[PDB]
Amino acid sequence: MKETAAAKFERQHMDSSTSAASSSNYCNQMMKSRNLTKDRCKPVNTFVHESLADVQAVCSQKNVACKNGQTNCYQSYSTMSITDCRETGSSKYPNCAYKTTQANKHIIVGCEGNPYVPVHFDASV
Amino acid sequence: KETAAAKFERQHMDSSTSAASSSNYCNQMMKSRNLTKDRCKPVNTFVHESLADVQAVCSQKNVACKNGQTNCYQSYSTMSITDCRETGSSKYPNCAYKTTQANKHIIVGCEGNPYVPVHFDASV
Numbered sequence: 236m237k238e239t240a241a242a243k244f245e246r247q248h249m250d251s252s253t254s255a256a257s258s259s260n261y262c263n264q265m266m267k268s269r270n271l272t273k274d275r276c277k278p279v280n281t282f283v284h285e286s287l288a289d290v291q292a293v294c295s296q297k298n299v300a301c302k303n304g305q306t307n308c309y310q311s312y313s314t315m316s317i318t319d320c321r322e323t324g325s326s327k328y329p330n331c332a333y334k335t336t337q338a339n340k341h342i343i344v345g346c347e348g349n350p351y352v353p354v355h356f357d358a359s360v
Numbered sequence: 361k362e363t364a365a366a367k368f369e370r371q372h373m374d375s376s377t378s379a380a381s382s383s384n385y386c387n388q389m390m391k392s393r394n395l396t397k398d399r400c401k402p403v404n405t406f407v408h409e410s411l412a413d414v415q416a417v418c419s420q421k422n423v424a425c426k427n428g429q430t431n432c433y434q435s436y437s438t439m440s441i442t443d444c445r446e447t448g449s450s451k452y453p454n455c456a457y458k459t460t461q462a463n464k465h466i467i468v469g470c471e472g473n474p475y476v477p478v479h480f481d482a483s484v
């Protein structure tokens with residue numbers, strides 16, 4: 236099988252099946268099930284609770300600078316439901332541990348391809 | 361995958377509202393919380409209280425579960441809840457429910473470390 240960059244973005248950052256984090260254990264569950272804790276604990280990770288079509292649409296919205304100085308990112312007009320997963324103070328690989336936080340913010344993504352779709356999650360703002 | 365405690369929160373917690381805002385609440389929420397995925401779950405209760413207040417019930421009044429198990433706990437205070445009951449006409453995947461608002465003690469089964477709700481047993 237093959238996984239494209241667009242597909243990796245879906246795995247790492249999309250959860251369209253829920254309107255918000257479904258429990259206080261959501262981040263522990265998702266960081267493991269989406270394979271984001273294989274070799275080390277990823278310290279932070281954002282999941283977006285919107286339809287795939289609505290997130291793909293951001294690649295046609297506001298062109299902005301990426302947090303690393305590049306200029307090829309896009310910011311959403313809409314405010315989106317997101318979960319931020321952040322490592323707890325006691326988290327220690329291979330026993331990673333996360334706190335589930337909820338927010339409603341604009342997102343910034345980097346895009347590639349035809350169709351032109353997200354391949355990188357830059358920030359929420 | 362999903363822990364028993366996490367499943368309880370998905371199935372039974374909705375602190376986004378103080379009470380059900382619509383008679384359609386159960387039809388919409390039973391679907392959106394995936395309780396109708398493979399079949400229509402015939403009964404379900406949603407609790408409109410904070411997670412902390414519901415988890416604390418596991419430190420309150422020890423009581424018997426409906427099946428006789430002894431790990432059930434009854435809330436000291438009444439809580440705002442919504443009862444969802446499948447109708448006689450309901451046919452999967454078009455699951456259909458009656459919504460009933462209530463304010464009653466809840467009875468939950470508890471397990472784990474920390475000791476938290478994993479099962480919703482009854483309201484009284």
Ligand SMILES: Nc1ncnc2c1ncn2[C@@H]1O[C@H](COP(=O)(O)O)[C@@H](O)[C@H]1O
Binds near residue numbers: 301305307345346356
């Ligand atoms: N368009 C982009 N594609 C991939 N990575 C980017 C892009 N723009 C910035 N980055 C940087 O890539 C890193 C994130 O890695 P990843 O999200 O796994 O692609 C961060 O250091 C970002 O600043």
Ligand SMILES: Nc1ncnc2c1ncn2[C@@H]1O[C@H](COP(=O)(O)O)[C@@H](O)[C@H]1O
Binds near residue numbers: 371403
């Ligand atoms: N397959 C089923 N048929 C009828 N009632 C069920 C079924 N599964 C769970 N219940 C009921 O669902 C409620 C919540 O149980 P629980 O999912 O264990 O928190 C209890 O009143 C159970 O009796």
